[PDB]
Every structure is written in C-alpha cells, then in structure tokens.
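Example 998, ligand sodium ion.
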Amino acid sequence: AMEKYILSIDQGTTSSRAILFNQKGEIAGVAQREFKQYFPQSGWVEHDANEIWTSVLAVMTEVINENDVRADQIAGIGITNQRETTVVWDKHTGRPIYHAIVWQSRQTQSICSELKQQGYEQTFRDKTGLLLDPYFAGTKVKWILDNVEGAREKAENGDLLFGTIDTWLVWKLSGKAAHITDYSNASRTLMFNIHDLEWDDELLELLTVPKNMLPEVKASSEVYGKTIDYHFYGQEVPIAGVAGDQQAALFGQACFERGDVKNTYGTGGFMLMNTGDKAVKSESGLLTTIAYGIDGKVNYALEGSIFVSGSAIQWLRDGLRMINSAPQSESYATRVDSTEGVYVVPAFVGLGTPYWDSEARGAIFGLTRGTEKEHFIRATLESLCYQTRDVMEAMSKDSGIDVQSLRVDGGAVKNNFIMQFQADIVNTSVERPEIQETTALGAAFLAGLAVGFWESKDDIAKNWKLEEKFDPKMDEGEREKLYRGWKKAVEATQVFKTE
Amino acid sequence: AMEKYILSIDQGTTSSRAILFNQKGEIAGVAQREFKQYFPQSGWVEHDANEIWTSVLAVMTEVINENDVRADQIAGIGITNQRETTVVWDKHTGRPIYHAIVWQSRQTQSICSELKQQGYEQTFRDKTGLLLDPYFAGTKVKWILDNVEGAREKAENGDLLFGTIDTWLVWKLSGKAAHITDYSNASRTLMFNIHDLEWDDELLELLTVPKNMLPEVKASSEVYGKTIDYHFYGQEVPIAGVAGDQQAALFGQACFERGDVKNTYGTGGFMLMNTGDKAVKSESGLLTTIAYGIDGKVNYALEGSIFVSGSAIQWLRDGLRMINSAPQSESYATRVDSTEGVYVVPAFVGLGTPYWDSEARGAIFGLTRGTEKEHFIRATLESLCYQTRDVMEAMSKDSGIDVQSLRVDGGAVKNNFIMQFQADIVNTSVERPEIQETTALGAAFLAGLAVGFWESKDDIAKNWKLEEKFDPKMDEGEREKLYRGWKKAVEATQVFKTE
Ligand code: NA
Ligand code: NA
Ligand code: NA
Ligand code: NA
C-alpha cells in the first residue's frame, strides 16, 4: 500500500518481540512469543537457538498477519538482541551443535578461573573493557569447542560458525548470505578489541577459538543484506540495523552524547551512559563498552550490569507461584508500609556490578514469624532499586558526572511502586517515557536511518515524551538506614559459598 | 457413668489442647483451640493471657461435652505448658497488667545485654543452668515492671503476682486458692537456683523482681488444690500434675533413667536427655534444667533448644500462604528429588542451641531461577532435621552417649518425609510411637499418679508402642555435603546484623 514501516525484532532473554513503527515513530503493531529457559545445573542458563529462531519467525508472521501492514510495506528490518548469548552452528546444515549458552549462565566458570590463574585478566580488561566473568561470549565458545563431542574437529575443519544472537538471526534470515555483527554486539564477546576495532588474535588464541568461525564486524546502521524471500513472504527486505539490546535502548532514549544515561529494567538491569568518542576505564566495577557505530563514528559507553532485575518478579510468578502476573506484585507490595527488615538479594546467577562474584546465589534476609507474602514480595520488588543504586554509585564515581535525572525503560517501569521506591532510594528523579519500547525503537531507527526512512537520529529526541516523573519523597535518614541494610544483605550473601 | 478419667491440659504456644485418658492409657477425647499470636514488632512475640485462659476453659468444656464423659467422672487434672512465657497480674482483680511475653520474644534483648555487660552471665549460668538470652522468664518480668506504667509501684505494694503459664492456669482454675509452680517450670525462669532448689535472692535482685510476686515451688506430681466449682461444671476436681511441656513429653516417652532421650517437634524443637539425680554442665550450648520432681526425688536433664521447628511449616501456611495445611507440605517436598542447593534457616527469633545468637533472623540461601515452590518447601522441611542434628552433635559431645535411636513426638512426626530425612541426615534410627501426644500423656500420668489412678510410672513404658522405625539410607558423602551447606547457611545467617 502507500504507507511504509520499519520492522524491529527484539530477541530478548525470555521472549522475542516484533514491533512495527510508522513514519511518525508510533507503534503500528506488536507481537511477542516466549521460548523455553533451560537450567540444567545450579546457575547454568541455556536456550535452544532453534527455538529462538522459530520464535522470531513466529512474531514476524504474527505482526504482519494481524495488524494492517503487509510484507511489501516493510522498508527495512532492525535486529536487536540479548547480548553475549552464544550460538555455534554447522554452516552447511544450519543446525546448532549445542544449546545457546545464555549470558546469565555460570557454566564457563572453570574456564574463567583457569585464565585468571594464568594471569590474563588484565589483558582482557585493557583490550575489551570487560573482565573474565562467565557473562561474556568468548568462554561460552571455548566451552562448546572443548566439551561438545566432535566440536573441536569441525572447528578445525572449517565447518562451524560462531555468533551472538544478532549474528545468528541475520544469517538465518538472509538465507546464509550475511555473517555479521555490529560493533556493540562484538564488544561483548571477549574477543573484539574495542580500542582498535578488530577481532584480537591474542585473545582468540587464549580462548582457543579459530578465527574462521567469526563474523565480519560492521557499523550498527547499514544494509547488511536482505531477507531471503522464503523467510519474508516472498519479499527481499533490507536488514539494516543491528545493535545489542541495551545499546539499542540507549540510542532509543536519545542518549547520544557524552554523559547521557538510561537504565533498562528487563530480565537484567542495565545502566549505560554514553561517553562520546572516547572509552572510559572504571575502577568501580563498570564495563567499558561500545555504544554504537553510525555516521562513520563510534561511540563508547560505561555500563553497570545487574543479572537479575525484572526476572526476580517473574520468579515470584513462575518459580514460587505467588503471583499470577508481574503487575499483580504491586498490590501485594503496597498493602504493607515496609518490608519490616526483609531483604531479597536475587543473585540467581551471581552478582555483576560492582561485586563481580560469579559464585554467589540468591538469598533472603531479615525473616520473622510475622513476615507475610506482602513483605516478601515487597522486598523482591525493592531489590530492583537497591541494585540500581549500587550501579549509580559506581557510575557517579567513575564518570565524574552527578546524575540529576534518570530516563528509564523496560517492563518493570510500568510499576509505580518500583519507580517511586527507585527515586526515593537514590534521591534522584526517574523519568518514564510515553513509549517504553526503547530497545525496539532504537533498532528501528538504526535500520530506518540506513534505508532513508528517517533523515536524522534527532527525530528520536524530538519524539520522546515524558509520561511520568517520579520525585524523591523519603528522608535522608530512612534512605541511608535502608541502604545500609541492603549492603549488609549483600555482604551476608557473599559468605554463602559451597562450591 | 461410673468410669473415671484423667484430664490433661497442654497449653501450647499456638493452641491449647485438652485430652482425656482412661485407666488403659487410651485417649478418650481430644479438643484443641488456637489463640492469637501477636508480633507487634519484628522479633517480639506476645499472647493475651485472658485469651489463653478462655482457650483452656473452651477445650475442657468441648472435650467432656463432646465425648459424653461427665465432669464428676474426672479423677484429676494435669497441666502442662509452653514454658518461659510470662504473665504478670493483679491479685485482686485477676487481670493481667500486660500481654504475656512469649518464650520466643526477643523484646527483652536490651535487658539481657545490660546484665551481660555488667558481668553477670556466668552467675546466671552457674545457678540456673541457663544463660542471659531473652528466652527465659526473668527478663520478661523485669520488662513488664520497667515498661508497664504503674507496674513497679503495684509490685512494691504487693498487688502483683508472676507466673509462667502453669502457675497462671492453676491460679485461675483453683479460684485463686493456689499460686504454685513445679520444679521443672521454675527452672526455666532465670530466678530459680536448680542446685539449691530455691528462688535465688541474688538473681532476683539483679532482675529487680520483688520476691512477693513468686509462687511456691512444688513437686510435679502432687495435689496442689482443686478446681473452683464454677470453672468445672460444679465439681471440685484435684489439680495434681504440673510440668513444663518438654519435660512432660520426656516423662511421657518413658525417659526416666540417665541417658534416656527424646526430641519433640512442636512450635520449637526440644531434645531432652534425662541425667538422673545430678545436674550436668554443658560446654556445647545445651541447657542444664530440671526434668521433674516425683517420689521425693528431683531429676535433671540436658536440653537442646530450637526456637522454630514446626512453626517454620506453619509459616509457609499463614505467612507466605503457600500451603493450605502443614500436612500438604509433604506432597510438594517429595515432588522433587532434592532442594538443589537451597537452605532455609528459620531463625525468626534468633538461634538457640548451640549458637545462642539472639540477634540472628531468618534467612534463605542457594536460590536460582529454577528454584520452585517445591524446592523452597522441601528446604523449609529439612530445616527441622538440620537443627536437630546441630543439637545432636552438641548433646553427644557434652554427654558420653551417642544416640543409637531417637524417640520422637510432636506434630511434625506424622510427616514421613521429615522423619526419613531426619534419620538419613543423622545416620541414626528415628522411632515414632503409636500415641504421639506424649506431652499430654506425661501430664496425665503426673496427675493420675498423685491421685492413685495409676500406681506406677512403669505403665508408660509398658503401654508405649512402636508405630514406625525410620532407618537411615543416605550415602555418607551426600550427608556430609548436605550438612556442610547447612553449616555455611548458618554462618552466613549470622553475618546479617543491622542497626
Ligand atoms: Na525478555
Ligand atoms: Na499455581
Ligand atoms: Na514447641
Ligand atoms: Na491403675
């Protein structure tokens, strides 16, 4: 028809989403499909990359069939994704050789430990902006090659390809035409040198990964290829935007300049501040990473990473079966006026910023006989806010900027209790936008800019609108007592080590 | 209708029960009524002594009325009770001047802290067999006298009486005719010297308790007085048995000789070993206490005290609202094969034997995204077994004897999962009797003995019947791994302390 749209695919940790955006920046359709989470041992997290692929096909098809947009009205596709999660597959069959190892997974701990013991952690820090934690892709690749029968040989024979999720989806979607990643996704692999913007041969040799398995690193806004016709209703549509999910949210929050910051509350909680054209080092447990590559420039970021944020609330539903839906948690949490000393430390897959303790597991403290369901749920919800304060403190310290207002996005932001508690505990305003799908919006703009659907990234800034600003309303004394109890809870959590 | 019965009152922490026994030792009727638990602040636990008194009247009435046994068929009454719990009342009005302060309550912490600071713990220990923990009566009397307005003045004037629950009930029931306690209950007050067998002047001065408030200390099997007619359907029935509930259970398990031991799983968990006619000092966190006074002799015991045992299960029911009843916990716990590294340390009111840490609160460890309701419940159930093991390691050290089989009673013993896991985690057989209401039976015998209903306590031994012997079937490697994580769980629990 006459109107054209951009299709954005957000392949998350627990679900895949496809959202259509019109010229005005409005959402013209959304579809979401969950896929299985595998936890074969304590702290491991795996996905079936085949199911992830079918979930992406499922949401593309749903969003095109069920709104008023046909495949021929799609001007371009942007792809964004859960970062670090690693897929290794056979290039001829297109079949993965093992589950995708998820970013959260701690299964590559023995590998990180060995590399740390051999004295290489500083080299990885200096070259990648990360550290030797199980979070990153490199060790997941090594794990697959070392532990899966036949993997090593196939790797040696040139039969295998590596990819983060963006890479996997583009290869499948393009009919094997394009094996690529962008700078933001590559920066999370532990194999890409963020300073010289090239795969690093030393790091690859330390990780025992053959260079023949790697995609070509590209900018985040560029026509990488097109959909193979049979995966897009007979049409060949430009695949033109790719960035890691948290970086996409950064771009979708118009945080384009040095000091601009946002926090995303998803499965995990990720605060990123754009540091412009220079990489900034951190002494307080932040990652130095790449924001995006566009217009021939590369922006870097400082990141605070929290492994379990919104997924703490989901655990209350799926795990303990205490609530029917995440939004229902607010009613329980607000039915009491305090947690009465209870803390929940949801270190289900260890602790990220600033602790970086991959052996810690989840714990709960301050329980008494009068602790009710309301208190427990309330404490679970406040853990999203306490973890964010930990990150903010590290971020304000290392950035040298005092954050006077945080833009936020992700599912948990709809929860007024959590947003207000957040503002209170950090004594900083929290701003929730009208369109909270910033990850999708960012990827849509990367693609749309590449195909000339939009002319300027500033449209994002212009279109952004404040839905609600939460202002701190809690005395310094209460705030400081509450936070001291949180830090004590984390301290106690770190003592529980059995492994 | 000719035949006579003994009525046994068990005034527990969460309910009062009245059980009728015939000459054959058979249960001829049971009535139970719950009363309100008050948790006004975290760690505090209070009861309304007026509601305890009406709950007792209620179960006496229900059990006779509903089993067609006439009041004039009761040959005697035995009273047993939650120990330490403290009532202070006006002798003219019979009205308590405050709630009863429960054994569990931590509200007397500061009072214990001051006496410890002043250097007085080892005097309390040497005289009473106890320690300066909020568990015991003495500091509860002081708290009431210091914090209830006008109370100090009324005490000084002779208007007030003190009683543990036994004393309160006997006073009310006899229409103010008898203000007494037995040696077992008195031994738990922090005011009674267990070696000299008398109220201790030094200890009263330190606690600031006037001696005029104290009842007379008697044997556990003696006619103390009779029911006042209007509280017992026009009859004046001998009140002839009084012992602390755990001591009554010891007696009811036929544990009459040196080395005989039982564990009772109730609100709390209590292991007592009879030590014959001599008091044994503990070096490993056991209390030295009085078992009972009968036939002109006084038996002593060693005790391991766990504050939260079966009440952890009740917490799943009324606190987190995860189960409909304690028995339903079994099906969830056995639906999985292990807790997968989850531990539940139910220190809601601190830790008793052997840690004696009154500031510790409840905690949970080892949580992952895959921890489900079933895991959480199972770990909660195992906590009863781990705490018992802690007490058994202590008990074995400060006695010579290593348990060969443990006689058990209380509400949780009906749960086969728990008894089997208990036997497995300690590598010792557990024997569950056919009649599990040993506390009630013990109190019935103390009464019946005193009125000639039974001529010998040997009948308890002869009537006891094994219902099921649980035999350990767990690999030693597994047992040691499991118990090591429990100990680490407790270590981490002890780190969480707030200001
Ligand atoms: Na997700
Ligand atoms: Na359910
Ligand atoms: Na109990
Ligand atoms: Na007899």
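Summary: Chain A has two domains: 1-253, 254-499.
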